């Protein structure tokens, strides 16, 4: 991640914008010291090692001796050093890769939290349309290449205007068509007036969430966050 | 021992114990917050006034409070809690009873409240447990105290761990009181309900 990439993603909470970066970690005993450190704030909780590879299906995929899942839960900070231990340094195998192995030098240490609902949204540049087009599904836990291939009217598409960008009445209605009624309505709008405000402040080409979800904080209030978000130029 | 390295300390011996994280400036505290955000994103916090108490919704409510704390009635130091789903306050204490010349373990339901007043109003309601320092606590007292505080399920035995482990601080330490008051039954944010510690003082 370059640091233009990474100024990004700040972007996302400056602009309003609600998001878990997690941490990064290049050895699993700096994976510990973050899990360590996390349960002095949330006591008991319980943390998700992310494989930090540029492929998908990670936590579909397996690792060449004998761990499965790029994406995983851990109960304690010392599971979180067995688990990164096996990935850092190490080939993750996926469908992008059948099995040429793609090595991992780093992981995401997140908080594990509690996910209601998961959706996909990514704004893209159109090319043949010379505009940007807001992407989105509910089917959530499914990916965008295979819900766009296999289903054809699953995906929501939104052209959008360069000059004014999006309209609430555009985002309400995505809000809607994505089943979200009270106060997650204009949650969500905030959210995705954000990752436009992004999108065109830092003149990118692609600004994906996989998952945008509604979760619980601890304290049990449901709010949009974005995860795993990525960014391309 | 100061409230940050007691709580330290029963960690180590086994206990849960919500430590937060210290802040020397109200910008300090906004970073705390800031930075708990990119794990739990959406949490509260609470903010504690060190050698009092306020909720805060946001990084920004954190600094508000923290800047009416430091430098103020004095003040010079807050920790920074992330904000934690709590269903029941107990009090819990091992005490070096003279009288008895043994240690003995108190707790009541009445968590949140000082001990002295408890005792004088609701005497009913103290549990006491003397302790055979040679066996130290058996797990079949720690058994009967959970259940006789109204735990049940996993809490009984967690409240055994935790319960043991602040026997170990005491007799480790040759101390002549832990107290955790509130022992709290909470909910992680996956909604676990665990026992944590979020207040602790050794005495000697
Ligand atoms: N911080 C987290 N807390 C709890 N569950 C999580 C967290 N991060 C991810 N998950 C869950 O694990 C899944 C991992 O998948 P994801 O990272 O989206 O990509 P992939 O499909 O490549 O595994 C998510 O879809 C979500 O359901
Ligand atoms: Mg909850």
């Not at 005993?29 to 930090?52: H, M, T």
């Not at 309209?167 to 969500?188: M, P």
Request: aromatic fraction near 6%.
């Amino acid at each position: 991640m370059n640091i233009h990439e990474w100024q990004s993603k700040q972007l996302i909470q400056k602009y309003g914008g609600r998001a878990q970066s997690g941490e990064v970690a290049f050895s699993p005993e700096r994976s510990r010291d973050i899990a360590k450190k996390l349960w002095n704030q949330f006591p008991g909780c319980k943390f998700v090692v992310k494989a930090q590879v540029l492929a998908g299906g990670r936590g579909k995929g397996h690792w060449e001796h004998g761990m499965q899942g790029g994406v995983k839960l851990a109960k304690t900070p010392e599971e979180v050093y067995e688990i990164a231990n096996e990935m850092i340094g190490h080939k993750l195998i996926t469908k992008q890769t059948g099995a040429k192995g793609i090595n991992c030098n780093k992981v995401m240490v997140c908080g594990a939290v509690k996910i209601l609902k998961e959706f996909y949204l990514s704004i893209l540049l159109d090319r043949a349309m010379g505009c940007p087009v807001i992407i989105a599904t509910s089917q959530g836990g499914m990916g965008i290449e295979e819900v766009a291939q296999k289903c054809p009217e699953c995906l929501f598409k939104v052209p959008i205007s360069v000059k004014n960008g999006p309209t609430n009445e555009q985002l309400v209605k995505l809000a809607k068509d994505l089943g979200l009624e009270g106060d997650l309505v204009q949650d969500c709008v905030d959210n995705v007036k954000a990752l436009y405000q992004v999108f065109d402040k830092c003149d990118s080409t692609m600004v994906e969430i996989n998952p945008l979800g509604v979760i619980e904080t601890p304290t049990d209030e449901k709010v949009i966050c974005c995860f795993d978000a990525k960014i391309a130029f």
